[model samples]
Target chain A: KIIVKHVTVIGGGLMGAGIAQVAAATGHTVVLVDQTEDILAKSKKGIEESLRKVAKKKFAENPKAGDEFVEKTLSTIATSTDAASVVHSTDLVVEAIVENLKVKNELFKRLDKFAAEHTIFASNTSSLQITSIANATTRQDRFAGLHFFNPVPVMKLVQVIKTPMTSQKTFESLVDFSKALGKHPVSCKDTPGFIVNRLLVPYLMEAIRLYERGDASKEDIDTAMKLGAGYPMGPFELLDYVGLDTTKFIVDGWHEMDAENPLHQPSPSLNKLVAENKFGKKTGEGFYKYK
Target chain B: KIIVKHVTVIGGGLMGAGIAQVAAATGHTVVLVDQTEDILAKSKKGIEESLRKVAKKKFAENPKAGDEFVEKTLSTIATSTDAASVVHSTDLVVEAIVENLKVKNELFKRLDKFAAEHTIFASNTSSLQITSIANATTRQDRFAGLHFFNPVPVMKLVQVIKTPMTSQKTFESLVDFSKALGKHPVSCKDTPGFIVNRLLVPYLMEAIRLYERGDASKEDIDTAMKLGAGYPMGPFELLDYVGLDTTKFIVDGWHEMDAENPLHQPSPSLNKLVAENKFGKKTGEGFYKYK
Candidate 1:
């Protein structure tokens, strides 16, 4: 199996920067690519600030060592304006660009022509299909999905999604690459929402439906799930934390995918909240208010 | 608003015994009634041991106080084989009996005839509809569902379910009574599974379906939920702990109620395991082996 030593993380956004940070921290040489030098610089700054928070707790007994750790990790990460220029030297390219299929395929297609023949490609998409994304490149076996959760530095899970055409070697390499970052990797097929979102999104929508129907108050439903099921957060609380707009977007996509699935039916209450600009905590209003 | 000072708990099962123990511990006069003296005695023994566990933690510094606490709580509880004979004096009768509609209705009907007009009746049925159970008695205004979770004393949640006929006075009394026992109460209409199971069972079924579709292995799905969603347990882990048979029964009933709901469809994997008598952790084998 090919071992990923040099990593190219496209799109210097939250997911992309975090992926670049972890890869660099784990001793892999990383190139963080984006459209502009300004955005890449901003992402690099965010990664440094996040690293300081991690370093404070990790090296409390040795402040000097913590500084060295942060500086050493940052040293391995290089920034680029174009992915095509960096793909020839990188062992793997993880795309964390916008969710638009056409845009992602265009980027991958351009890079497929410039990248080394052995370089593996993966998309860090939570909603899009990995197979569809892989269809843009000639090396289908080398392409897969590597999904990371928010605050990727803190969360331990990494879903290595394999398409039907994703070779065993490619899948294993991605899994091994995830392990190298000290994250727990779970295998999944390139299905809708993968595992967590597949089960959770519908459940969240059901909770919304339950509230919309007046079967129970949202406050009561939230309390019931927290106390009754021992969940960390109730559905509404999660929806608010996740942003009502993000949830609505996911539900709408699923509803479009399987129009007959009652579970995927649009939640009027959710749509109303998003319509009112109450996206969630970020907007200061959603299912609940945030200061 | 009637304050429940005297309570009668029917059934010598885990939930019933737990209700009796908590009620008596919280200073209510409780009569634990069952069909046979032997069953009541066994329930009392279990409650005593459970109380000891609680007391040890509650009054660790003072062994004498812990012993006194246990004795005082036990002194408030009186066991009887005849529920109908004791209903005349109790302020509330909590039926934690068999889940069968006919059997529960018969017990409530007989108790309603002998009980005081002011006595409120509540069924602790997790799966059945409270309205159908309320229909058996003439005092529909006084009847509601006071659903409790498993190992009731440890779980702090008590779902106070109110049917359309349930008077506000009765609903408030149940809520007040639950708080008196140091539990948080959430209100819901008389609906299937009240708040918890209505949302949870279907989510578990969806997880089973996700696994059944060969999207991901059960173990990986379980790990994904715990790590990705920050759930206390994965869907499969919860199913095994809750017993696959119990979940299957709940889903089967829900499917019967709404035959068109694809979300409520039965799982072949779950049904096959249950058919083979691999119920769950209790049977030592389920989605995964226990021992």
Candidate 2:
């Protein structure tokens, strides 16, 4: 059985807030820790807004149940400005801070010194190797990676990533934790992008390359994927949703690590889009111009 | 703008019957032609059973509407052993015959001699090049590929394949026809496997190769795909659903056509399964044992 009695999440960004909301809603007392008081407030507001959306959708089906769930979730989450205090008594600490390895390593080092021996340290890093991240800490056996998809409440799959040094008990406990939260857990090695992104990111990049080669227009490519493949959204549309700069950064990171994987080879067109600052739906332009 | 008053579907197997049922259900009169009376009767019975299933599912929501749909579908379909007689009146002909090039070529040659100049010819061949099939017909301008998924009434996507010789008008008309049946149509060039199979088949084969390399157990691989990738089913599970021998045959055909594509190269283990006649769910064993 998985017991997530008290969980602390670091960072106040989109991923961090989303993770905190999910953990709190699933009956865990959560501490959302950030760098400053202002950022912590913003993260708390974001969590409330997300919970409200969930309430609205669910309340349409069952009013009493939905309202109770929302209220319970809101009451369970607490915000903190200091990481040292937050890490001292938590059962699990998930760091969803900035993607810089140096910053992440520094935070893990501090958590290692402050937290209890049984406290599990997890990173929400999508692409980085969990083994290397765990190396920054003292308790390698208790370190594992818990990757949740975007819009945590809606997406049901959780990737439980285990490194060579990660204990089987730790991995199994995390899997149970995911199941307790009503999410399906799939175990994976500390490989690049785990599973979904490993196949999906490359396929999306290849679609961009096809567009650059003038094989088809953006509309045609998107239409083909949706109508032909039964995909919910096209690659270009998803790239825009994922931000071009972020997408480019990921590809570049992979390319630097291994040039042999042709899928990670960045296309000139992708670079141009990032350089132009047309970073998808946020900036209103990507493969297709959005009004 | 696309008027398909008479739709002729060749063959009387599962695929052929399902295609004919969907077309007829959507208000087009369908002529289901086979080489023998027994096959044609069997196909007609299958179509009726399928319509009954739909009627049972929809009757709870709207009784009169469900009854009307089933009645109209059963009334629209006409079965025959004579292919030439069926083609003489068909506005659109979708061939779902055995996947033998010579047999399909012979059928198309006869169809070309009998069909009207405006009649649109289509093949439901999953892997064969649309251009090669069109080459057998004299009115190549009207010849295209209309690939439908299995259990056609449920699957919504239809790949509209356009060869070099196919006219733009023909492609547009087919797209319109697809919409009339309430199906989404995606257009693609006469490339191998069109869209879905081009990406999916190789992925399935890769899963087999992974097992051959002893990287993971069949159960684990399937679990990983289902949990990690959010796929409807694991690769091996899907391979069993889509017969292992069939999977091998599709890959082997691609290999024979172009050995340069390493993805299509068959594994020795796959060949061994075929030899042992452990051809997936049909035979109760392939990569994994089925109960």
Candidate 3:
């Protein structure tokens, strides 16, 4: 069990909001931080709306109980625009900021000096190395990754990434905290893409390559993977749903470092779609046009 | 469907036996052919035993009805050592023999001239190229792939691979035949490793590469994939169960073709284990040892 109690979640975006909502719902005091009051307010609103839906189901038999649960969870989450101040009070700090290495490194460096000596730091990064992020701070032992899937309130899996410098105690704390938040945590070393994304990114790009090579039509390719491989979603369906831009970002990044890795080769077709601003469901067009 | 009634399943291995069993169980007159009488008898016995197990549960309420079901299904299956004679009578032929290009082409060459012109040819080959096998047959329009998964009666996915030369009628018949056996069918072009394996092989190899590099403990990697990615089996677990040697065969073939493809690069570690006879669950030793 972690001696940690109050948790600070930086960045009030989609992932941050979801992570904060879950932690608060599980009865931990959650402090959600962002750059502006407006951003914090929007995150707060999203959590309240999400909590109401969850409460409706949790207290189906008792409406009053549902209301109480929602209010209690909301009360536990405090919004702030000041990361430096919030770090002083929280027991653990989870960063879910924009995926810029310099920006993350800057924030961690600032928080390292501001936060309590015992406060552990973690990131909700989907595609970055924990060691590189932790390298900015003096507390590598206390810093690790707590990467969560998007729409984190529902996806029960959490990848608890442990860097070579990550201490055993900190790793245990992260594991305990993830489980405490009611997630099934799986551990992996601080490698590129951690676990899920490593296997996933290559497959996503390969499907694009396979489609591009004209071995099969996109429709039939999607059907084959879904029906033949027992996958719930086909590669294109997943790529579009996951966001073409997002897939492109990961592929392009990996390809840059490993130029010879054919799997990471940037798909010209994908880039052209991105140039058109068709980034899947969010934009209503990607590999397939959406409503 | 096609005025085709009698189905001949060549080879007396696991996939062939399963395809024959399902076809027979569903009322298709199935001719199961192997090289030797001993192999044919063994395959017949395997089918009968598998049918009994299926019948035991399917008609549990009436044991006599189950017996009738078995007798009827068994009656549909006729074992033979001579492939030529069997093809002479059957309307469709499915080759599920050993995965070798030369041997398969040789078999198809012999049958192409001996069998009736209306007798469409198909292969159940998983890794080898279907187009190459179809090249040996004069009935190019009548040749395709009807690849059924192992333990065929249970694994429902049957990939209907179509070569460019395969006729529309032939493709439709394969689809209809797969449906008649109550299996889900997915169509894809004749390509390397087909659909499932195309996506699966690289993912499996990547997991092995990750394990070898100590990115994560094998147990952790397996756990991460199963719980985090919602895969029924982790890549390593699948590699062990699916036979390391079998995977090596496919991977080595792909690697031989494209040396620069990072995904296809041969894993010296995987080959090391293969050399030691640790194929997987059957051999009782692989990534993990078994009792």
Candidate 4:
């Protein structure tokens, strides 16, 4: 039986804190680790604010329980600046560190040296190959990926990535772990952007190109997709909300990997937007300028 | 100024009756014409039932006003077996007749002879070339397409299609007519399926090919699109809802038009499903076995 009593999350960034919040809320003792005290403090504040907003939203239904839910989540998360000490005490470590392969490999290398032999190691890397991260560990069988979507508390999906070296037992346990956190878990191979971004990114980029080509106005394209196709949001609106720089980066990365894929080829219009520092909703200018 | 008071709906199928209901509901006198009296009666009954459902749903909010709304709509619709009478009496004639080129040509040819010079002649043909329909009329400059989606009264979009010979003034008048009916009018060239289905059909067909290749299960493919991409419905669910036979027919038509377009190539699996009479929700069997 895999008793996930203690969980440690490395890299106290947006993804790390989101993972910690979910883990803590699901009755696991969580250790949120960061390289510096300032980083840990920032992550702690973000998670607390996120939980407070969730609490208020549900308060009308259950006033007392909603408040208690926030308190319980906050109480379960323990912060630590020292990664090695946190890893030594935890049963599993979920790394939501930087996307760079070297940085991820280095973090896993340190975890391998300090953590228990049977301790599970998982990466939250959305696009990178899972095998590369797993290879950095001594016990490759225990390593896998628990990729979560943005705004993790709100999004219910957690893609459980299975690498060739990852044992079936580890994969199954991670799936159960994901279920415990009240998430719908789907198993996926370690392909580019896994499943969602692989298909979505290209479609979004095409929408941008269509706008650039003057095939239709941005507003019309967005309205067309929403009313015509029943899409929740228009592609350009989503692209801007997702950040133009991030969109360009993802497409550029795919382009480098495979030049023949027409969908991934970077649009000059997007490159121009990125060049101008109009990084979508983040910088207030993309396809449509935001006030 | 185009005064759209007397609206003539050609054909008494679901699409035609639904269009007539909207015009009637909005206070326009509707002349709904059909080739046979049987179809005319069936359409009238369907429209009445739909209006009653709307009234029932709204009566709880405002009983007297809801009752008045339903009564007014029912009073405005006039059914006719003589196509010439409907064409000559109305200011606008919107054809939802059979999609056969010969049938459409003949109907327009007859309307050109009997109708007033200023009567707006429009076809609701989803697939056939609007230019050819316009060619059947002497007043080509006054002819256009007023393509309404399925379940016309409920769907808000109306594509105002303009052929090469269709005068700008005629196209503008059609847009005004759509706006008066509280519908969003999108102008497009007389292309196949206009905007929505032009992009959507190929994507839906490609999804079927993916399922046929055993790349993923129907459930997983559906789930991936719904959860991962945030689409309103999975492609398979939509394909089934659209009817496999209908989807195959559309693709086959597109394929025949252009063989080089790989996206239009009909899937063998879809063909097999159609062959077995698993047409979709209508037949109660498709990607998912419907109850």
Best by DockQ: 1
Candidate 3: tens digits of C-alpha lDDT, residues A1-291: 356589999988777988999998898988999999998887889889988888778778999999988889889899888889888877899998866677889999999999988899998776778998999999998999998876677777898888889889999998888889999988877778888889887977888888888877787777766665556678888788667876787777778878887778899999999999998875789999878
TM-score against native, each model: 0.88, 0.85, 0.89, 0.81
What is the per-residue lDDT of model 2 for residues A69-172, given as tens digits with 9 covering 90 to 100?
87889788888887788777888888887666678888998889999777888998867788889999888998989987765667777878889898888888
Q: What is the DockQ of candidate 4?
A: 0.36
Model 2 per-residue lDDT tens digits across residues B177-226: 88898888877777777666765676677677666765566776676666
> Candidate 4, residues A1-291: lDDT per residue as tens digits?
366678999877667888999899889999998888898888888898989888889675887888899888988899888778877767788988756677889888887999987688899885677897899877788898888876678777788988888888888888888998898999877777766665567667667766676556778767766776778778888888666776787777778888876667789989998899997764778877888
RMSD of each: 3.2, 3.8, 3.2, 4.2
Best by lDDT: 1
Candidate 4 local lDDT, B129-193, one digit each (tens)? 78978999888888898888766877777888898899888888888889999999988777675
What DockQ, between 0 and 1, does each candidate earn?
0.76, 0.29, 0.55, 0.36
Off by over 4 Å in 2: A1-3, A34-42, A61-72, A80-85, A98-103, A242-250, A275-291, B35-41, B60-72, B81-85, B98-103, B206-234, B237-250, B253-258, B267-291
Model 3: CA > 4 A from native: A12-14, A35-75, A282-285, B35-71, B154-156, B276-278, B281-286
Model 1 CA deviation exceeding 4 Å by range: A12-14, A34-49, A55-81, A243-246, A272-278, A282-285, B34-82, B269-279, B282-291
**For residues B1-291, what per-residue lDDT tens digits would candidate 1 score against the true structure?**
889999999996767999999999999999999999998888899899989999999998999999999999988889999999999989999999756677899899899999999999999987889999999999999999999887787889998989999999999999999999999888877888888988998899989888878888888988898888888889988888777776777677778888988877988989999999998775789988978
The CA lDDT at B102 in model 4 is 76
True contacts kept of 4: 0.26
Ranking the candidates on TM-score from highest down gives: 3, 1, 2, 4
Please, what is the whole-model Cα lDDT of each candidate in the order they appear? 0.88, 0.79, 0.84, 0.80
**Clash list (residue pairs), candidate 1:** none
True contacts kept of each: 0.85, 0.16, 0.59, 0.26
